[PDB]
Nucleic acid binder design. Structure first.
Lengths: 636, 49, 74
RNA sequence: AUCCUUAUGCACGGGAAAUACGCAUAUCAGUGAGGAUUCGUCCGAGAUUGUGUUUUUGCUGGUUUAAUUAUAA
């Protein structure tokens, strides 16, 4: 703690603590060069700028060729991960691909790359194409908007999928040949397990080990993640051999992250918000004089525009010219070409000032435009929601996170910024390629700073949320037919990620059994009981308490196929009726649980009002209710 | 919760120390703030002092 | 003797002289403040929505009138 | 070394008032201001003049909704 805070500044509005940049790594190792590779692998790095691998990569690489084993990398994800995955891919290709005969063996190996987001999948795919073009490989996307069919999967070799669509592809019974063919299963951002999509990954993992026992040849599993505690427990979840585990701290990061907080001493929201804006302004003023390109995160998208307006009138009151003093002719040109043409959320004026913003709710084209302009650097300041850290790789020298309380429809309450989101926001930083270090900043209330220091140290385990997704996963598995009884269910649950975590800390995750049942037999079986009661109530699976026999129903099969959540499922069950009509169909569709996170907005409200007058299919609900918004959007 | 904390024949409420009350009062405030919202569909966090 | 509903029921508030000879009701303590806080809450969120979003209500005669609208042996 | 008296400074705690507190390149005033008396005497520091503010001085508090993505084709 004491080494972390070096220096603290006290200011009238706020008390700011300035953490120094992390230490540079000790060298016990050799930087591994490219000429050490075999013949075909030397084009793995077609542009070899250093001709030597980064501090993280070399050791993990030679270990990766040396062993064929399940591996885990907890790393800054400083662009180091992309190349490592590429290299393991090339190894599998060489194992199925002869060194002498240069014909690539296409039908032997199959590869899967699990990237949480569609956009990041896209980016990855272009990377894999660039690096793998010399072998003559088809690298194509299996997920979502990708829209690959029954055939192209067979044709392709390397796959880049999102977790959801990969889950649904491997869940289906007919394709199992492809699943067996895949030798190489790469999991990017295994730290996702903390978040509620992570349940899908652990379910996929469980299916890989447990579900294919009739062919029974286990594929190579490579986890790739941001640095996280309880790495050992992660390995015990997967298989991981002790040597495959590589834990690298932030000292191995390309640009050391200078951590900074401002505690806010104010309480009432009207002065508190003003104090935050003042602090942000002060930071921006310190940054831009150094020629620093800056990002300011916020909670909500509506917050972005008003924040940028505040920076325009305030920042401009201070000095107008300095933001663009250079190439003002070309800045006027490019700015008018971009802003004036495609933008229509009254965001053009912000672009024109040269403080822009990016958020969900900005047009897809406008969105790409803002990214590009901020890359060129006519945009000095970029106000953003949480989309960028999660999605896009583009780093920016200074990163400010404004505020604590985010509203989550999960609770229906304002919670604190969750650590897993904070960390990935801090990830985008001073550019590893160009700049030397980053500036992280967190605009926050002082009382919660004590919390953010620790959670920002990344001492927090990847929390297992399997409790919510357990039921649906179990149903899908019964549909596969792999579980005929409670004992089978708990054996599958032994390879489940919550199992490990329970073993580590039973009372944290509410194991009553504790001393009893070291293997948590009765705890596992009790969860299965709990699941199969509600499933049976939803007529998803057949179950009997004392006799214990399991079988899958038609509704359960449907939920498995289209990956409907169990809540959505029972909603359909009751709300659909014999006499239900066209009006009620849209209402039920709206009621689908996947829209629970949807809510009506005040900038949306005028267009909603115009719609619902002329809407052909009537709405029983009203403008204030999100369901009505959903089904009118459906009509549109 | 704690049977070791004994209501005498004299008193109504059980005898605690101060800090035990300090926690209990928070636990009691929790029921109020959760059920007011839960009944009225109102989020706890957004409430002003 | 008129009821509204291991539960206990208490007398609802009524004026002496305005009540005079009239039917008296028995309601639950939590149910009375329950209903009152549901209705008045519905009025509060509509207050914040009206004043914030600056919308003008249709209301008038029938709506305000309908807003004016708002046995056991022992 | 303990204990005590007086005056002054700082201060925790407890009251009362703000028709009350002050200011003066200004006139006097223990070298006698202003009063009192039982008619012998007795008390002993302000009085005039101008002015500032005075239902009030400073400072505060309350009230007037993140991202993301899943079908069998």
């Amino acid at each position: 703690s004491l080494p972390e805070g070096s220096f603290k500044r006290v200011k009238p509005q706020y008390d700011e603590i300035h953490i120094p940049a992390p230490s540079k790594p000790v060298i016990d190792y050799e930087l591994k060069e490219i000429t050490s590779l075999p013949d075909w692998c030397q084009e793995a790095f077609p542009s070899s700028e250093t001709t030597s691998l980064n501090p993280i990569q070399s050791k993990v690489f030679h270990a990766a060729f040396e062993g064929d084993s399940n591996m885990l990398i907890c790393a800054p994800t400083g662009s180091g991960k992309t190349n490592i995955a590429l290299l393991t891919v090339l190894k599998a290709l060489s194992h199925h691909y002869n060194p002498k005969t240069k014909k690539l063996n296409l039908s032997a190996f199959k590869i899967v790359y699990i990237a949480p987001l569609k956009a990041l999948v896209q980016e990855q795919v272009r990377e894999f194409q660039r690096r793998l073009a010399f072998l003559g490989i088809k690298v194509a996307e299996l997920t979502g908007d990708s829209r690959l069919s029954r055939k192209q999967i067979d044709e392709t070799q390397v796959l880049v999928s999102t977790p959801e669509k990969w889950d649904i592809t491997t869940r289906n019974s007919n394709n199992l040949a492809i699943v067996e063919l895949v030798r190489l299963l790469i999991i990017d951002e295994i730290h996702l397990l903390h978040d509620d999509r992570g349940p899908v990954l652990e379910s996929i993992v469980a299916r890989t080990f447990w579900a294919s026992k009739y062919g029974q040849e286990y594929p190579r599993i490579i986890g790739l993640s941001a640095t996280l505690p309880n790495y050992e427990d992660v390995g015990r979840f997967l298989r991981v051999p002790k040597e495959g585990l590589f834990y690298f701290d932030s000292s191995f990061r390309p640009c050391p992250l200078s951590q900074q907080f401002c505690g806010i001493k104010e309480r009432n929201s009207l002065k508190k918000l003003k104090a935050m804006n003042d602090a942000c302004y002060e930071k921006v003023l310190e940054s831009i004089n150094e020629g620093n390109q800056i990002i300011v995160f916020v909670h909500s998208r509506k917050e972005t525009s008003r924040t940028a307006t505040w920076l325009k009138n305030k920042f401009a009151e201070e000095n107008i010219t300095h933001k663009l003093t250079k190439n003002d002719a070309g800045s006027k040109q490019i700015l008018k070409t971009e802003a004036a043409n495609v933008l229509d959320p009254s965001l053009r004026k912000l672009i024109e000032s040269g403080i822009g913003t990016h958020h969900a709710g900005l047009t897809r084209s406008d969105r790409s435009l803002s990214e590009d302009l901020f890359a060129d650097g006519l945009l000095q300041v970029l106000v953003c929601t949480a989309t960028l850290a999660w999605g896009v790789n583009l780093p920016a020298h200074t990163v400010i996170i404004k505020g604590t309380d985010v509203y989550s429809p999960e609770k229906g309450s304002w919670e604190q910024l969750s650590p897993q989101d904070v960390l990935q926001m801090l990830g985008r930083a001073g550019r590893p390629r160009y700049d030397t270090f980053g500036e992280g900043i967190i605009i926050t209330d002082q009382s919660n700073v004590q919390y953010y220091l620790s959670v920002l140290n990344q001492q927090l385990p990847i929390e297992s949320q399997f409790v919510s997704k357990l039921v649906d996963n179990l149903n899908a598995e019964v549909v596969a037919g792999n579980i005929k009884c409670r004992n089978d269910a708990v054996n599958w649950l032994a390879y489940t990620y919550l199992y490990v975590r329970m073993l580590a800390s039973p009372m944290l995750y509410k194991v009553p059994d504790i001393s009893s049942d070291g293997q948590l037999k009765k705890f596992r079986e009790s969860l299965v009981h709990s699941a199969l009661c509600i499933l049976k109530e939803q007529e998803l699976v057949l179950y009997d308490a004392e006799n214990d026999v399991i079988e899958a129903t038609d509704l359960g099969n449907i939920a498995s196929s289209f990956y409907i959540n169990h809540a959505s499922m029972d909603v359909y069950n009751r709300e659909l009726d014999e006499h239900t009509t066209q009006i009620d169909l849209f209402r039920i569709f709206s009621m689908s649980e996947e829209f629970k996170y949807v809510s009506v907005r005040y900038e949306e409200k005028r267009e909603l009002k115009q719609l619902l007058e002329k809407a052909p299919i009537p709405i029983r609900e009203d403008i204030d209710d999100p369901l009505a918004k959903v089904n009118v959007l459906l009509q549109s | 919760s704690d049977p070791t904390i004994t209501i005498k024949s004299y008193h109504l409420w059980p005898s605690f120390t101060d800090e035990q009350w300090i926690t209990i009062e928070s636990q009691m405030r929790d029921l109020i703030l959760t059920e007011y919202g839960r009944k009225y569909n109102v989020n706890i966090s957004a409430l002003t002092q | 003797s008129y009821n509204i509903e291991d539960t206990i029921l208490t007398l609802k508030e009524s004026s002496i002289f305005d009540d005079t000879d009239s039917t008296e009701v028995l309601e639950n303590v939590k149910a009375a403040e329950e209903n009152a806080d549901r209705e008045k809450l519905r009025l509060r969120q509509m207050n914040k929505d009206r004043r914030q979003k600056k919308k003008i209500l249709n209301v008038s005669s029938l709506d305000i009138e309908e807003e004016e609208e708002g046995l056991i042996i022992g």
